[PDB]
Amino acid sequence: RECISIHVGQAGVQIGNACWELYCLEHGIQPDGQMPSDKTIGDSFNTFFSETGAGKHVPRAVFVDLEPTVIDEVRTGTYRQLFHPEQLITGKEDAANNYARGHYTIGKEIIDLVLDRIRKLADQCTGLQGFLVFHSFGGGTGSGFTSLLMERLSVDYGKKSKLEFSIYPAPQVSTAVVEPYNSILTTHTTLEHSDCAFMVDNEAIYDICRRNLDIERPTYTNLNRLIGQIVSSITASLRFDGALNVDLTEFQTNLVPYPRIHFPLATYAPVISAEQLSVAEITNACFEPANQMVKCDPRHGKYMACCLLYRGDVVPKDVNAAIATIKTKRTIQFVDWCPTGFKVGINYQPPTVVPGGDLAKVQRAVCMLSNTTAIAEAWARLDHKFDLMYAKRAFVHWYVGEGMEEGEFSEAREDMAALEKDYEEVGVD
Amino acid sequence: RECISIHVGQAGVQIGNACWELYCLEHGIQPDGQMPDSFNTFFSETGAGKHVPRAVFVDLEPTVIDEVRTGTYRQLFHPEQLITGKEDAANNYARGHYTIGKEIIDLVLDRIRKLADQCTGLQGFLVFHSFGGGTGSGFTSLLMERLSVDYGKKSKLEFSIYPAPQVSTAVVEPYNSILTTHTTLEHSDCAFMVDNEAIYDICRRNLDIERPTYTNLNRLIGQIVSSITASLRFDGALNVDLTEFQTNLVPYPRIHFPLATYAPVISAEKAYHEQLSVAEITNACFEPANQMVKCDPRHGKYMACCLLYRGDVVPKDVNAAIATIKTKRTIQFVDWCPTGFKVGINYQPPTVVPGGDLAKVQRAVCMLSNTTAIAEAWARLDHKFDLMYAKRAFVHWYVGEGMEEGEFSEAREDMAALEKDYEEVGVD
Amino acid sequence: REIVHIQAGQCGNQIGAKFWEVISDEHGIDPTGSYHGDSDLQLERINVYYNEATGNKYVPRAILVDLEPGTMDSVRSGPFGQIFRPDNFVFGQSGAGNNWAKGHYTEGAELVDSVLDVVRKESESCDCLQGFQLTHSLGGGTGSGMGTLLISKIREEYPDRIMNTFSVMPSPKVSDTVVEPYNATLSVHQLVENTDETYSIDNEALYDICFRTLKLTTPTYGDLNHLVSATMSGVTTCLRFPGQLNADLRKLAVNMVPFPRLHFFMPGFAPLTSLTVPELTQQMFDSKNMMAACDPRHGRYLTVAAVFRGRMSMKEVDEQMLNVQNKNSSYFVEWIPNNVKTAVCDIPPRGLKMSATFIGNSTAIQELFKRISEQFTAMFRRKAFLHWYTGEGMDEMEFTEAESNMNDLVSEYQQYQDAT
Amino acid sequence: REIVHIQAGQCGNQIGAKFWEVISDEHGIDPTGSYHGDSDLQLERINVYYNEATGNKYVPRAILVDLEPGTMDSVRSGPFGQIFRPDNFVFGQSGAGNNWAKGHYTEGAELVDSVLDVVRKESESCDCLQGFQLTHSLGGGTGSGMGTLLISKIREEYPDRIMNTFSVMPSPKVSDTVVEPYNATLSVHQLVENTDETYSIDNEALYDICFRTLKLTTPTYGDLNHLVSATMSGVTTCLRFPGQLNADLRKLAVNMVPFPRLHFFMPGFAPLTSRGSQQYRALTVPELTQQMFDSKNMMAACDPRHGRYLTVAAVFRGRMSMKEVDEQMLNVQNKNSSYFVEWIPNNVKTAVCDIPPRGLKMSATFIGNSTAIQELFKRISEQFTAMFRRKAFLHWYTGEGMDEMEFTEAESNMNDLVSEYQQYQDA
Amino acid sequence: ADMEVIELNKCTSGQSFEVILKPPSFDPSLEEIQKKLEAAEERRKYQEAELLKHLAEKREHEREVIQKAIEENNNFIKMAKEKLAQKMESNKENREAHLAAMLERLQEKDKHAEEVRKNKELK
Ligand SMILES: Nc1nc2c(ncn2[C@@H]2O[C@H](COP(=O)(O)OP(=O)(O)OP(=O)(O)O)[C@@H](O)[C@H]2O)c(=O)[nH]1
Ligand SMILES: Nc1nc2c(ncn2[C@@H]2O[C@H](COP(=O)(O)OP(=O)(O)OP(=O)(O)O)[C@@H](O)[C@H]2O)c(=O)[nH]1
Ligand SMILES: Nc1nc2c(ncn2[C@@H]2O[C@H](COP(=O)(O)OP(=O)(O)O)[C@@H](O)[C@H]2O)c(=O)[nH]1
Ligand SMILES: Nc1nc2c(ncn2[C@@H]2O[C@H](COP(=O)(O)OP(=O)(O)O)[C@@H](O)[C@H]2O)c(=O)[nH]1
Ligand SMILES: C/C(Nc1ccccc1)=C1/C(=O)N[C@@H](Cc2ccccc2)C1=O
Ligand SMILES: C/C(Nc1ccccc1)=C1/C(=O)N[C@@H](Cc2ccccc2)C1=O
Ligand SMILES: [Mg+2]
Ligand SMILES: [Mg+2]
Structure with a gap:
């Protein structure tokens, strides 16, 4: 029936803003929220928006980041009119490109609030389906809050499934060296609380534009327009009512044969x-x-x-x-x-x-x-960096710093090793 | 002296209705019962006007007995003498004898006892019934066991309808015949079999009828039966009474079948x-x-x-x-x-x-x-029975309603042995 | 004497819809009201499929179960919409899942008791309820899972009365869900112990009847339901029409089933879409016109019924009927003697002057079960998509427990290519 | 998010001064008042380095400590004089000594608490204080001694927030005091445990850039401060400008530091000179990149050859095509592939902000964790133990209340930091 | 064959007579069975009340599945409610004394600095 979007993290947020935008074009909503079509009181596209008040069409979304900065540029450029000032949580201090900070130190404080502001949106829904969590693989709040969210969402919401769109991180348009650590960290705590998970390889998107769009050195808002299109073709099934893929189960009951193997x-x-x-x-x-x-x-x-x-x-x-x-x-x-x-x-x-x-x-x-x-090719092309660094404790001390454990790193690589194993273990007989 | 007709089962009932009809023409009774010793052998002079048949009609659905309380003749019987029973026997003996039977039998048995009671020296009964097929095999069988007990010497003549592939519908037929015919035969005196196929045959050759109806077949049997019973309705020497019926025809207790x-x-x-x-x-x-x-x-x-x-x-x-x-x-x-x-x-x-x-x-x-x-048809049946039971074929529907794997065994057994007596009468 | 109808599931319901409006035409009923037609028969046996209500009116004896609004307001909004009594609609709200367990265990049993509640008050109203019939898919939960549940719960309450289903065995080609083999094998098991007859209907057939036999490119769930709708009218007729049979439904079963398992009539039809007697008969006895995906060749017929439709000479009928049994004498069993009876009712269907329907207990149905069990164990292999049921509260071995019940049913059908 | 600035010592202060007036130009601020300039960016990130006061006005977030009047009334009387808030000035009166102890122990701690009092204000006023930065000399007490103290006391109060210094490693050639080695080693020790990044700046370099690479005869403390002023603008930019990073200062350190000791970015610059010498526009990108990656243009006196780059940042300035940048960037990593470490993967990221500095169309700043920094430390420690030998000038600290073994105690902490850098030419 | 008849009766509306042709040439019902009809009911009542105790069977197994699932589900929530706030209060105690461990080295380059002025003011 209903369907809530969470976008945590600079990357999450901007992918979000760039597909809530494209949702908006598709269903014909002028920025201020009002659409001149005969399809509201409060079926069909009510999956994502809620007909709140007598005029507007608010997205059923919540936006979280730990700086303002990014969430700030929503309450700025038109669309400013589109959400509810509630649904955009900002948090004063950054996560600093670091998971430990995101999960344990800076997280702790904002999670209680978010968790509950989500519960507001689930409450204006008669039979909610699940959540769409948009977030960055590597990188701070994106790996570390997302991880904490899911652990908690997992508790606060029963069956209610969880679909993540991760942004797998790519040397060329990154800035952060410490990246790999963060991805293999989250991905571990994260995977037993997730249902199906679309990875999006920044490099491959950067790739498409350099080849297929003739863009010299493509922007973020370049990349996001592209992802915006893809996501909206995935979510498409549940928004216009589709001849196939029309609910979260028989959408993915399709894709994942085994509990672990999410990644289509x-x-x-x-x-x-x-x-x-x-x-x-x-x-x-x-x-x-x-x-x-x-x-x-x-x-x-x-x-x-x-x-x-x-x-x-x-x-x-x-x-x-x-x-x-x-x-x-x-x-x-x-x-x-x-x-x-x-x-x-x-x-x-x-x-x-x-x-x-x-x-x-x-x-x-x-x-x-x-x-x-x-697709486990990128499960190692990551792993290997992580390996070749931890091998020297490389950047570790920044984690143990905020409060983490030498062994929680061990233990997460352990999980990929084992996963990398299941993915190999599915070939032939 | 007197003489009661029982017709159990759709086939029975319709043969009945088509020969009570022919009795009626013969003795000149207008439907309403009024006609403007002798033939008191079948009808009773009840009330001051009418001429009710001394009959009882039983079936386990309504449907067929229902036709009677509909088309003139509706006036001819007593609402009492037509027993109907709500649910079908479903083409199966076990159901007829044991499951659906149990319930109605006590009622019928007694409604018969009403008619025997308005009779000073009753002779016996004429049971009309279908060989194969459900209530016809099953109730008839239970009736006879019981009529045998409630009535001493009083003889029993059956007219069986030996079943024929072309105008049937039921596959399970053979079982039901060989079933009843077993329980039934030591409680019977003389028994006229009527091969549906042979009657279907007469009409196709002798009447020019393309694919003949039931009411086509019944008019014919109605004529034959009424030529058999004739003896005891006008009173003309030979078969004046049911005892003579066997005395002339059946040399041996078992061999009934003329x-x-x-x-x-x-x-x-x-x-x-x-x-x-x-x-x-x-x-x-x-x-x-x-x-x-x-x-x-x-x-x-x-x-x-x-x-x-x-x-x-x-x-x-x-x-x-x-x-x-x-x-x-x-x-x-x-x-x-x-x-x-x-x-x-x-x-x-x-x-x-x-x-x-x-x-x-x-x-x-x-x-x-x-x-x-005539024991040619005792085998032409048997063989089907044999070639089915051989595989337990339809058996489970029977064991179902309450019957015994071995009661089947034991009935073929009787035929085997009968088929034997019938062979054992040739030469010396 | 009187029959109620349960019609559960997106596939089960959109079949049920088309069925109802086609039989409702034969009798002639206004999308609401009563009779409009120069015929007079109809109403004899309308008693059987329609409990009648106040005013003029006629209302079907139908219950519609689904585990989500969607497909119910399709019926009410479509063809013969507001024909069914408003609260004979059992809503779902929840998920369905295209998953057997949800429908037989969790979200199913969640409802169920509300269904039993309508059925109990139609059947208890019904003056001599002879039995129920049900329509539904076999791959996919709300029909195959709930309904197999329904029937288990429908017996026990009504041991007594005879059960009956048109079930739609799913194919690998022309389907939605990867899992259906799992869904099927689970209900197959269920059916084989709780129904008394079960018309097998392959969508591998239904679709094949359209592209090999009909020059229709893009086969909907429309023109394909159309067949089932027709074939269903066919099979019913003589409980609902003449008076040249009389068709107890029980009788009808007793004479159709030798062995208590194995009630798996593959059906077939005469002409097709939107006719001479010979060319009608050697047409309902062609495989390229059966409703299961079999081939009634490798596999001999246990029992066989056909019902013919059209004011025509049946003096031709038994003569053609005979002919098939001799032109094809080998392929009927010998050990049941008069094991192919036919009858004829003369009031034709929508369109079509002359038509025929073939009900058929052929051991070649083994050919269908084997086809599913083949892609089933091929999946239960390294225990694949199974984790969708793992978690639903089902057992590891409970799958194997019903995979086996099926491989019996295979080699019993194989065990009945026997001897004189 | 917001940063305060402590600027302590004759060498620290006259650097501080030049810093301020150069960044104050980029944003465009009147020697007192507010904005005057056709640009409009500037002010986005002026939030960070300028706490704004009443009227128009903009006043730096600055604190000036010295242990004598002299050099404080140089600023107030000089270029951008009366720009700093009058009582952000922490006067000294006493001696300085050019002696570490006076600054860190006696005459320093004498003041100190008054400095903590301004800093505590600004930072407690500051709405999301991210961290502090500091400027100062390393041979000579008021800067090296007081500041190393300041920081130690700055932390503890502020654990929490990230610390940061441009410190001026002293050379034997071009300096005033015989003792500086002593002064240096003592602060080096202090720094290496208390800062989070520490731009190394050799006056061996700074002077070498002037006569080697300028033909500039009589090098002042003037043209030479000039470099540091520039290089400091360089480094700051992207916490104070675009929106193409976003540069948390923390993030900024996390991604720059492997091992919690060793935060010793030797830096470097694109162009150079001030007076009667030019550039014929020719700053090209290629010829800009193989220039901020040449040693003859490093801010420490190393040679980022013998010694391999741990991590390397650069930031580029000028409305130019960065489609050229990453292509040249790459090229350096392959033309010089050997001399990067393998075990941190993507260990040289670069970005670009397009609003140029004073003069100059195109320019580049190199921030630079090279283990060749070991080269610098080793140079001082070499003339340190060469002096702690028959314990010479030491008696100036003997008497101040310092311990005999306390010199050796920090001579050693340094020789670790030598062979940890040596221990990171790994596998 | 030309035979002679034996006249066997004459009445109102008929006449009977034998016609012998070629001389011949010489050569316990029991009532007790009504207890048979309620032995038939012995086995019916056994059957139907067995596909009941085999059906009221497949029933409170359903009880299982339906809940032996839910029972195995919250068996995850209250496995991951402490795999959290006791993995996470392990964190709070962890860092907080790597703060102390940061600070208590301060009081020690601090209460060291104190004592060597009380030593300067004695030199
Ligand atoms: N595809 C895509 N990736 C982005 C975008 N913005 C940032 N990223 C990537 O995000 C990853 C790191 O996650 P961030 O959201 O930037 O970091 P965060 O800690 O979660 O958010 P902040 O630290 O508060 O800015 C890196 O791989 C960046 O390349 C974007 O707009 N599109
Ligand atoms: N001669 C004749 N045979 C009939 C007639 N009706 C049915 N039969 C035959 O009887 C056999 C089936 O017997 P039924 O009398 O129908 O079975 P039943 O249980 O007595 O009747 P039901 O109540 O309908 O089940 C088949 O061989 C039919 O061909 C009929 O009207 N006349
Ligand atoms: N012909 C017929 N089959 C269908 C129809 N819809 C789905 N099916 C088939 O039935 C199977 C699943 O049925 P579905 O309705 O999706 O499951 P349910 O709604 O939970 O009962 C699939 O293999 C489909 O091929 C339809 O309406 N008509
Ligand atoms: N480039 C830079 N370095 C300086 C400057 N003044 C002095 N230095 C060097 O840095 C050292 C420390 O500065 P100094 O003022 O003597 O330390 P103070 O005791 O804090 O005042 C000096 O000994 C010089 O070698 C300055 O003008 N700029
Ligand atoms: C055996 C039989 N018909 C039949 C009976 C005797 C001779 C020829 C055909 C039928 C039939 O016509 N319809 C099914 C009964 C049925 C089953 C489900 C729904 C409606 C009707 C049957 O078994
Ligand atoms: C990490 C980083 N820059 C950088 C950031 C992202 C991409 C490329 C370079 C820097 C930088 O430019 N300057 C220092 C931050 C600094 C240094 C001194 C005073 C204030 C702030 C740093 O860490
Ligand atoms: Mg962050
Ligand atoms: Mg569906």
């Missing part, structure tokens, strides 16, 4: 720059390491569940024979023990792009959600 | 051809085609033979006709009983149902033979 690989279809493609051709893109969403290589790992999420003008009569010659040309690549997939999700709502943005209006777009075993 | 053959079945539309000769109709009785149970008595031995004549006939004719039934056709007698032919004349011309299928005939004949070839 996304692939967005026609990224093409303003200043059109065939139903066949865009499908035949989803399987192209370039157009990928996490830098890896799925042609060599096995697929173990595959979704195709179509959006736009499409008759299934096309989709089919297109797939047909995905199998008689390219690399099939299936696991020992699960059918040969392809849940196929048609949504007739044509894809809208941000007005003076980078991309153009497309007729049809595709979205492929694959749970391949090759 | 074979009937009705004479001139001919269709109105032919109603004005120069009608058949005393000779020719006799010479029909001995024709596997005009038979009443599908078999072949030319190759089994006869062991008692009756000819029941009805109509305009002087005996001088009958005789020399028979004479050349011998010197032409197949004699075929058993080692040790005269050479038969107890011959029954009844001067009452045979009446047919008005807008019926057959025509008014001058003379008709009826031949009741106790041949050992």
